[PDB]
Design a protein around this ligand. Sequence first.
Ligand code: 5RP
Lengths: 208, 208
Amino acid sequence: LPNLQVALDHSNLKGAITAAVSVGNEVDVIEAGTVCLLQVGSELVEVLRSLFPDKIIVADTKCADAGGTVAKNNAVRGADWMTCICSATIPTMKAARKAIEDINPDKGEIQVELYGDWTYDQAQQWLDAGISQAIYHQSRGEKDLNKVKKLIEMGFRVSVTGGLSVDTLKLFEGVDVFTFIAGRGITEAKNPAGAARAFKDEIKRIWG
Amino acid sequence: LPNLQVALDHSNLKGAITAAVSVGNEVDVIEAGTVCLLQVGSELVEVLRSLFPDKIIVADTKCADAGGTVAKNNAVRGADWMTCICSATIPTMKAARKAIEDINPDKGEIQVELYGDWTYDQAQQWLDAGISQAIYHQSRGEKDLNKVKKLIEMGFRVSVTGGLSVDTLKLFEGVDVFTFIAGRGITEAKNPAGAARAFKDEIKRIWG
Ligand SMILES: O=C(CO)[C@H](O)[C@H](O)COP(=O)(O)O
């Protein structure tokens, strides 16, 4: 079944912790968003790990460089997955993958954040480098779905994000989407917990 | 004259503050580096601003998205310049620019961090969005030097960085480099304050 993921893009610590706590049990994956990490730093990751010793935890660093160092700094905090921006060189991605695998051999992975003009040849390089997650951001239609389908076809576990709603999941019917990332659709609600069960309920209806 | 900038890429706050305090008067620009911000959050910017009321301070966020939030978050902390990764979309770069100018009308600017396969038509797009700084990274030679000249010639103030020794500023002679960014050559020297002087002295012979 497609994972439900919550992205915490709050500009402060309390916002991220409060949303995480109110939706934690309704979701599969918890993501410390980039906006948030740039504000509060990496301790946030260790807090999420303590609150959710079993959840999958994402450190959304959008790493462009010093991959071994950034990957390491977040892995010691308890992160399972870290994002690298697609414009990171292959050596950066491999340095990052190596480090998250050393600290976290259980679950350590890199996910590629897809921004601007990337290519399928680049996509093949990521795969050849041991990296098979990619995150596809909804365009700001069929042009998007085809990109998602092709990335799946190539061997990626594909996460999709960018304005989602409990009612716009059926648009992905028959697609092997690995993870749905909901941010604001949950992190403003309320009964965010219920909003999140809603999302998870729809996924169940459509993929069960 | 070409600026000298130190990149604070430490994985902890004490490392960033110590290096800044010890080399700050030797440099023209102080940069809170991505690795560091991802660790300690944006308060670092505020304490640098407090330590150096007049210096130019860089928040190296390599923002890929939510440009308005990330630029504001760092501008209210006192940042003068903020990096966006070259794969961020134009609207993202515009939102970032508008936020930083809104809070820092005097010195507020965006810098484009060049990673991966960017184009001169992307480059031109940045200029049209009112953004005129780029930061070019040495590759892991003539090919590099030539890219810098072309960027200067389009109307960017180009910053150059990547394993810069002082002994390697000579190969840029007669090139209108706007800023040289030194990280480890300053921050891991055995005389950091001396190393920084070596750098800006060498720059003083060659240019001006
Ligand atoms: O910070 C970086 C990562 O984006 C640059 O590589 C750094 O600014 C250059 O530092 P050094 O002189 O140690 O290569």
